[PDB]
Ligand binder design. Structure first.
Ligand SMILES: [Mn+2]
Ligand SMILES: [Mn+2]
Ligand SMILES: [Mn+2]
Ligand SMILES: [Mn+2]
Lengths: 329, 333, 333, 334
């Protein structure tokens, strides 16, 4: 029997400091989206969380670099619960085909609260129409994924979220559908949704003004300067923000997780050469590099493969050093 | 504030005859998807419904042709309520039934259910696009075939939605022409799913679906059209490769028509030719048709579409004879 | 599957006139309760409603008397559905509207709202007894006066209920003549309460009520009757002592009539006599009345109670003329 | 405000294997006493109202030793009453206002209620309560082994309906002025099937079809005069037989049978003891208002002392419990 959001919000209410972090981080991000601050948002963390222990451990380390680089970068953890394909730690938290959604949603809120409490903001992918209410309050940045950027109900969903939202270009490279997504997400909508209490209702939303585009490759990779400058023109054409995010992983690195660093080197070049239209990057990253089918090694992905801790330090310093130079000019 | 499904199911319960017409039409379609019957499913009617009255006059006309071509074609009306916009605009009758930015969703939901009931009661089965996660509980019982649009075919929740529907479901290929996503949608929709949904009583719940065995593909065009025998033949091999039904539907409108209503006949004509040489992979087609041809920004003229432009009634009578005769021959073999 | 109140409200919303009649009848009763108007509230009508048709006819007749005597009396119809049993039996038109043990509650409630709306539209305000905690929401907007019966006057949850009702409320003395429990009840109902209740949408919620200032006591006999002037005077003294309105209602039926429907006229004769004398603490009366007199175990004769025995329509004209005239005199002084 | 449904508390505080076994077993043992199949004496005993779990848990440990020591003469069950009926107004109890300060934090209160009950059952002490609200019972009824319908609600159809659908035995009190018929009638109604509106474990209103509660009985709790003595019991037993219902009954030592004097509960007890020695075949149980510390107070200043009706203290409780055990050992011999 499905518990409503209110049951989880009661056991695990947001603390003052988690509340303050989220509010502050959401704003700080807004500033990057509309070009009021020249720091670089870095959404970095695992492809997917399957072990809360590990995620917290990962946070601790990320925390040191988050504060270390705070004048140049704005580091925020990837806390994605799954990959649209095990459909997650939400849909199946025991990793054994048991589908215990009540436990999953509880565990997800708990991890989210714990990270916000220790100073680490959290981002995630909003896939379902109903699950967001259970932890959206703990989320500082949200992704609508390549497979739903074109869906009306997902643009609706984003139009009512209190955090900035990144729309990915379509699976085969289509950029218009993300630009459209911003236009749709920015305006008011009326639609059916589910309340904190678990009842259906008509919601009226006010529009999300802090949406932006995410370049994640396609038929070919769209991360370089020319690809970025073409994106910027199109965004200016449609009267939406020409500041965008580049996903280092997935279809931009193709089938090689270690190529994340090359893309990052290339973004670093742009930032030292000009890079005016870049406000963020995304990186798939974990304690231990690579992937595995079943979860036997601690802190190594069971979905898409991720760079390991060593390379993450490397990749962050690379970008930190690069963006310091852009902020100077 | 929102009325639950059960409220509409109490005012507008399904009749003995609607129920059988639906059970019957669904089964009849499954057989088309599984090649047990080689009639041609013809999903035909307006782009979107803005006026129940005109849709009831339309249906009465189209029913005469349903009875007349029943050995050759299986005709089912297009009764589209929810509309996917590219950016924005009127999202359909459910979302905004007074056409004036009021968003009287309870009224809209009642109107749609009543129209669909009236249609089954007169003997015209109905088809719609399932776009929202929640609205289907209000009138799925009246639906003989549903579609998942080009824009939502890649979505996991729409796939799960399909997997719990009792009617056959057609997935369209994506807006650029990508066909893999719809092949993948059949894969997923055919399996059992656990996900979150809403009950008849208006509450969120866990639902464990049995999976929908009667799903199929719809070719509706992309960067360039995809209706001809060659494109049909490439798709067919891909379907057999993935080990799912190689029977598919071809849409004559949208990207296959280059968004022009005077090309829909052209497409139907290439389909008739295919049907006459062979075309054993074609189990159905789709056509945007209204009492009157074209479109209009505002609902001024009766029976004229305010969304995509449609062919008129005269042009519809032709298109149907065209396919009726072309398919009789195929069935003769 | 129980439909929420919003479903019934959507189908039978209140009309401008029904709303005005309720609003204004409620205020007129408040006046009578707080001694600002010396007309006599008369709560008259069948013991229980088992036939809406016969109900609507009774109103028509009663409507002509409501206006004739509008200057002396304020006539409001007894439209009780929900009936408390000593043990068990037919609990009412809500709980079992088909009279056959089918317990079709959704239909019952729809029928109850429908009758109430009609009665109001044609100009006859309605009164009822609130027994259940959940069913009030379905039609309380159509109710001008409410009763908490003798068996629940001492119940804390019914006192809480009463604290949130927007219409005046009569508490009866307890089944063996205890009056204190009713005086207490007004104490409770007059205050703010916090408790669990159910919303217009069918969900449990915490409600906070502001208190009902228009409560009063009803004298309905015990082991011995309590209608006469001495008991009336004895009651007023008790009221004034606990700091509540000393304006009360007297039941002419039940333990005051010794469960004999003929004795209802005896009691009204005594009230009439008190009104001619002085009787300044009487603000209303109750009468169990129907088109046809007496009772039956099964609904065979039209307009004849199947519960407690009522006076016929003949005896009604007589009892109203009698009270109308006696109170015209009191009003003169 | 935002009431959590029973499923929320049921999920945080699921009934345990042991609690569940104790509830099933006590409910059955009680049914036996109601229907003249066992001669032990059911003893409902504990504070008038719970205003502090800690004290309630300390109380229970003590009473557990005596439940055990007297298990072959008495069946002991703690009074864990949350909801209270005021004559007019007042604190309605720990559920309705758990911080004691006018805050009506009912979500906290229900979680507190469930936690206490669960802990009580987990430690081997079954629990009884009065069911006053239509909606609260769903939050912890599963942890209750015996229930009470109060004197002020025994004549109410919806409290009879409620009772008809409880899985535990129920005792209906006689009316505040001594009316016994209303309670005999109430067993009548409660033993039959009803259809009525209630609220689900998930928080929605629903139609419920109840099966009937066959283990209802009467409680003599006084009226204008007390009704505990032999003469009153036998006259009650005749009225019960007359109406076709069980002539086994419970006698409340407190409230109108002790005329609101906590020191007379022992006198009542003594009278009951005699009747168990003389014959007493219609008695199946007793109720006592007991606490760690005797008397009462308007504010929860002293620990283990009632803020509602006055209770006898631990000492008098040890005394009263031995007296009854002794006297019932003898009745069980015959
Ligand atoms: Mn990934
Ligand atoms: Mn269209
Ligand atoms: Mn009556
Ligand atoms: Mn007490």
């Amino acid at each position: 029997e499905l518990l409503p959001p209110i049951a989880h919000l009661y056991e695990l209410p947001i603390s003052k400091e988690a509340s303050g972090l989220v509010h502050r981080t959401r704003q700080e991000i807004s500033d990057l989206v509309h070009g009021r601050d020249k720091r670089l948002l870095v959404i970095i963390g695992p492809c997917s969380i399957h072990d809360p222990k590990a995620a917290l451990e990962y946070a601790e380390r990320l925390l040191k670099l988050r504060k270390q680089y705070e004048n140049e970068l704005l580091i925020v953890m990837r806390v994605y619960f799954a990959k649209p394909r095990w459909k997650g730690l939400i849909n199946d938290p025991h990793l054994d085909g048991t589908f215990d959604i009540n436990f999953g949603l509880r565990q997800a809120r708990s991890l989210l609260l714990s990270l916000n409490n220790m100073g680490m903001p959290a981002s995630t992918e909003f896939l379902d129409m109903i699950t967001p209410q259970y932890y959206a309050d703990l989320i500082s940045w949200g992704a609508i994924g390549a497979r739903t950027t074109e869906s009306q109900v997902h643009r609706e969903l984003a139009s009512g979220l209190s955090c900035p939202v990144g729309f990915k270009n379509g699976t085969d490279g289509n950029l218009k559908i993300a630009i459209d997504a911003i236009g749709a997400a920015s305006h008011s909508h009326h639609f059916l949704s589910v309340t904190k209490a678990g009842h259906s209702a008509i919601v009226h939303t006010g529009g999300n003004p802090d949406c932006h585009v995410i370049l994640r490759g396609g038929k070919e990779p769209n991360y370089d300067a020319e690809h970025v400058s073409e994106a910027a023109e199109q965004l200016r054409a449609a009267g939406v923000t020409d500041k965008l995010m580049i996903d280092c992983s997935h279809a931009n690195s193709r089938k090689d997780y270690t190529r994340q660093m090359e893309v990052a080197q290339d973004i670093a070049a742009q930032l030292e050469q000009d890079g005016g239209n870049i406000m963020g990057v995304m990186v798939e990253s974990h304690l231990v590099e690579g992937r595995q089918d079943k979860p036997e090694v601690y802190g190594k992905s069971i979905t898409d493969a991720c760079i390991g801790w060593g390379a993450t330090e490397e990749l962050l310093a690379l970008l930190a050093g690069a963006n310091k130079k852009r902020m100077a000019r």
